[PDB]
Amino acid sequence: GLSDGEWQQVLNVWGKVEADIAGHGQEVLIRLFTGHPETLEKFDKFKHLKTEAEMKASEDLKKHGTVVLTALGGILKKKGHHEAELKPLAQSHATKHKIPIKYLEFISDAIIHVLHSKHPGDFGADAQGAMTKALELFRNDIAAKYKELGFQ
Ligand code: MNH
């Protein structure tokens, strides 16, 4: 679990994602696809995207960015009483989308990167440790549901 102070830090930082949810979400997805181009094949509608400028110019990619970060926002605000939120998310990602836990680790990393990049020296040692622990918990709780289901 995180501590109370650790959640407060997580949620304060998520305060800044919510000022520009679309632009954060899009930078997240662009970090992901360019560092890990196999993740791009999971999206039928994004594999016409050969360049960054193409990625950067896509409103549909930004739309997905928002869907992603909005649902993570909800999850985070439940502070690890997040089972009702998280369980059907895990099921769709295992059975339908077929997203390996490794791609989830890649997007966690992309979110840490994007918080540092968009908030240079405003996202400190302490806040970065708590967000990492919060994303680890997210990932741990999905991994458990994945194991149940035999996914990988
Ligand atoms: C945090 C990480 C994270 C969150 C909160 C997340 C939340 C969602 C939500 C909400 C939806 C819409 C409802 C659903 O269950 O289909 C959705 C659809 C999707 N998700 Mn994912 N998703 C990922 C990471 C996430 N997704 C990653 C990483 C992959 C890709 C490599 C991915 C690929 C999808 C695909 C593909 C869809 C369906 C896209 C479409 O509409 O065509 N994702």
Side-chain angles (χ1 to χ4, degrees):
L2 275 63
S3 58
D4 271 348
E6 274 168 349
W7 289 124
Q8 185 195 39
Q9 296 231 263
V10 168
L11 291 188
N12 179 252
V13 168
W14 197 261
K16 314 170 166 62
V17 182
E18 284 175 358
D20 188 18
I21 203 112
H24 281 83
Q26 155 178 286
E27 290 189 57
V28 177
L29 283 191
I30 281 179
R31 188 54 186 191
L32 176 65
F33 301 154
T34 63
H36 310 276
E38 72 282 19
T39 50
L40 189 71
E41 309 305 303
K42 298 280 173 179
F43 302 87
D44 280 335
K45 55 185 176 154
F46 306 149
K47 35 198 159 103
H48 75 95
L49 295 161
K50 294 320 176 319
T51 63
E52 211 148 300
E54 283 165 337
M55 289 176 202
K56 187 91 187 79
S58 178
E59 289 292 319
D60 210 42
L61 179 148
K62 179 194 296 206
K63 202 152 131 195
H64 188 66
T66 298
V67 166
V68 177
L69 288 194
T70 306
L72 184 63
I75 303 182
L76 297 176
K77 295 175 229 267
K78 285 311 261 274
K79 306 194 290 189
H81 294 93
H82 58 201
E83 158 71 345
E85 283 72 57
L86 190 136
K87 187 220 154 139
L89 231 237
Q91 293 190 324
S92 105
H93 289 63
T95 312
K96 176 196 249 323
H97 300 311
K98 300 162 172 329
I99 309 306
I101 208 77
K102 186 88 213 168
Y103 291 7
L104 300 171
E105 173 199 15
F106 302 155
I107 202 166
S108 296
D109 292 348
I111 292 159
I112 298 292
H113 181 87
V114 173
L115 305 172
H116 289 281
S117 163
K118 288 186 87 77
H119 314 269
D122 176 17
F123 176 50
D126 62 323
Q128 127 147 280
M131 181 65 71
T132 309
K133 277 179 75 157
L135 300 173
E136 284 166 338
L137 183 68
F138 170 72
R139 224 154 67 230
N140 194 62
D141 289 349
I142 290 145
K145 305 281 186 258
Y146 271 30
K147 178 166 174 285
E148 157 184 336
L149 294 161
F151 190 58
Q152 265 63 19

